[PDB]
């Protein structure tokens, strides 16, 4: 890109490298993402372009879609730190509960907004949750997966994380629903509380079995239709569900209750973002400022 000035290489995005850049005509700093190649689907540019229309305090604004020199670029508002880094920085003391609650509440608002606009994320993870000094947290990359197509591996041959993947996706369901995002957010909520990833699988089957070992191997009783999912196998080991109090100590009953509703196996039974916002866990929610080291 010329219309920009690459300050640094922020990191590795799901679809390509992410750069911290400066708009040459405005002097503004943004998050520039180069999308990894046979012409660029015209369907994608149209889909993605509609996203520039989404506007919410908890959604990282897609400023522009730039298609020039037969290369694709997405220009996003720049935020100063991601939740992965903040969690790592908060590892010794943990994120204070009131801030964890504020972040969860805000993320649910961003989800509620996108879902009401018929937009799913499908690949929520600590790396695409961005925070600022003011106490806000925003979701980036909403609607990209559907417009594009989650590739097995990036062109950088970097490992894609499966830790936040809903069980229905792992079982090979090719139809997504808003519930996949609630699942990912539930996993993130648990990780903020315990300071350890909930289901750190290193493979698709390891990821599935780690979920099974904690929540019990699903059956037709708790998840009608599961034995007919594409990758379900009658040979899956049968693990008993573990007492949920052992899962996220020392989160209180309201928090554990909300989390269990975000982690129901049946997508249809999983709580909606809108309903979650009404949960008693948020009765005393506030908006604390985080201690960010930039
Ligand atoms: C050190 C400050 C970095 N600032 C950033 N700002 C934005 N907007 C970022 C992203 O959208 C993503 C980057 C990677 C994924 Cl995955 S989403 S990173």
């Amino acid at each position: 890109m010329e219309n920009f000035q690459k300050v640094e290489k922020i990191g590795e995005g799901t679809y390509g490298v992410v750069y911290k850049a400066r708009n040459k005509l405005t002097g503004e700093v943004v998050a520039l993402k180069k999308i990894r190649t046979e012409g660029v689907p015209s369907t994608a540019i149209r889909e993605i372009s509609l996203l520039k229309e989404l506007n919410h305090p908890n959604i990282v604004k897609l400023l522009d879609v730039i298609h020039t020199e037969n290369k694709l670029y997405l220009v996003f508002e720049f935020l100063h730190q991601d939740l992965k880094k903040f969690m790592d920085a908060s590892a010794l003391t943990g994120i204070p509960l009131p801030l964890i609650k504020s972040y969860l509440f805000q993320l649910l608002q961003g989800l509620a907004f996108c879902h009401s606009h018929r937009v799913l994320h499908r690949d929520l993870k600590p790396q695409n949750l961005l925070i600022n000094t003011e106490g806000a947290i925003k979701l980036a990359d909403f609607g990209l997966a559907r417009a594009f197509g989650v590739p097995v591996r990036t062109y950088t041959h970097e490992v894609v994380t499966l830790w936040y993947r809903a069980p229905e996706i792992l079982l090979g369901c090719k139809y997504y629903s808003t519930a996949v995002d609630i699942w990912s957010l539930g996993c993130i909520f648990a990780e903020m509380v315990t300071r350890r990833a909930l289901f750190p699988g290193d493979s698709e089957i390891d990821q599935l079995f780690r979920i099974f070992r904690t929540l019990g191997t699903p059956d037709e009783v708790v998840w009608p239709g599961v034995t007919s999912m594409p990758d379900y196998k009658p040979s899956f080991p049968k693990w008993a569900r573990q007492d949920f109090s052992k899962v996220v100590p020392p989160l209180d009953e309201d928090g554990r209750s909300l989390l269990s509703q975000m982690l129901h196996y049946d997508p249809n039974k999983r709580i909606s973002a809108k309903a979650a916002l009404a949960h008693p866990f948020f009765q005393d929610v506030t908006k604390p400022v985080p201690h960010l080291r930039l």
Side-chain angles (χ1 to χ4, degrees):
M1 262 294 112
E2 64 166 54
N3 307 82
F4 289 103
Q5 299 186 299
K6 306 164 188 174
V7 177
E8 316 176 308
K9 180 178 299 178
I10 293 179
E12 289 298 314
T14 70
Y15 295 116
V17 290
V18 184
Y19 294 118
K20 175 176 186 176
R22 198 174 199 73
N23 188 299
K24 293 216 65 186
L25 61 82
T26 52
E28 59 183 295
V29 305
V30 305
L32 186 58
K33 314 191 180 189
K34 314 179 75 297
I35 302 302
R36 160 190 163 192
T37 299
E38 294 299 304
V40 178
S42 67
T43 60
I45 57 82
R46 294 159 191 155
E47 265 259 289
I48 296 297
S49 295
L50 290 171
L51 300 183
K52 312 167 79 301
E53 287 48 55
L54 271 54
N55 305 313
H56 186 87
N58 302 120
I59 294 299
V60 174
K61 186 198 169 185
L62 171 57
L63 295 173
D64 222 320
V65 171
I66 302 170
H67 190 198
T68 56
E69 251 52 273
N70 281 285
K71 302 300 285 57
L72 195 174
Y73 293 94
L74 303 186
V75 184
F76 282 93
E77 66 170 303
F78 182 85
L79 271 97
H80 267 81
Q81 190 160 289
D82 65 34
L83 192 68
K84 171 78 173 72
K85 184 180 192 320
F86 185 60
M87 291 196 289
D88 287 343
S90 301
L92 295 195
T93 183
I95 297 172
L97 171 56
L99 181 59
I100 290 182
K101 185 171 295 184
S102 172
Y103 282 171
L104 184 59
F105 187 65
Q106 291 179 66
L107 294 171
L108 284 172
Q109 291 184 63
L111 280 195
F113 173 82
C114 292
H115 291 176
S116 68
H117 283 66
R118 299 161 161 176
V119 181
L120 294 50
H121 184 116
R122 114 146 273 299
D123 187 34
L124 282 177
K125 50 199 173 181
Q127 299 195 318
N128 50 40
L129 295 186
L130 293 148
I131 61 177
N132 63 23
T133 52
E134 253 73 57
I137 183 161
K138 308 189 179 191
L139 306 119
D141 299 349
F142 245 104
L144 276 51
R146 170 165 176 169
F148 296 126
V150 54
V152 60
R153 285 181 179 173
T154 57
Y155 77 110
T156 59
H157 313 296
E158 188 182 60
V159 190
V160 65
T161 187
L162 304 172
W163 302 1
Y164 312 101
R165 198 73 84 231
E168 58 265 40
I169 302 175
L170 296 170
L171 292 173
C173 287
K174 354 68 244 173
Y175 310 95
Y176 301 75
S177 84
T178 52
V180 307
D181 290 339
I182 293 300
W183 178 278
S184 303
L185 188 56
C187 291
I188 298 177
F189 173 27
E191 190 176 339
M192 287 191 277
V193 172
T194 64
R195 295 138 76 178
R196 190 167 168 172
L198 183 56
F199 302 127
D202 56 48
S203 68
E204 217 162 301
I205 198 60
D206 182 54
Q207 183 65 37
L208 194 57
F209 287 176
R210 283 180 172 278
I211 295 168
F212 288 4
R213 294 166 198 145
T214 295
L215 306 174
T217 298
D219 52 22
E220 285 295 323
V221 172
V222 303
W223 188 357
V226 66
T227 66
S228 297
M229 313 236 111
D231 304 324
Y232 174 81
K233 305 294 173 183
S235 54
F236 282 159
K238 188 285 193 183
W239 282 288
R241 184 173 178 89
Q242 299 302 59
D243 196 306
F244 205 85
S245 62
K246 180 176 64 165
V247 168
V248 290
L251 187 59
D252 65 58
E253 199 58 41
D254 279 322
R256 284 180 280 149
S257 169
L258 171 55
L259 178 66
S260 75
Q261 295 189 110
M262 295 175 83
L263 299 179
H264 274 141
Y265 273 120
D266 189 346
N268 305 100
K269 295 175 182 57
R270 222 171 280 153
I271 193 174
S272 67
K274 179 183 188 175
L277 290 173
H279 197 279
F281 179 63
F282 297 116
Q283 201 55 51
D284 62 349
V285 67
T286 64
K287 188 183 175 186
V289 324
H291 168 55
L292 259 41
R293 182 69 317 162
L294 309 170

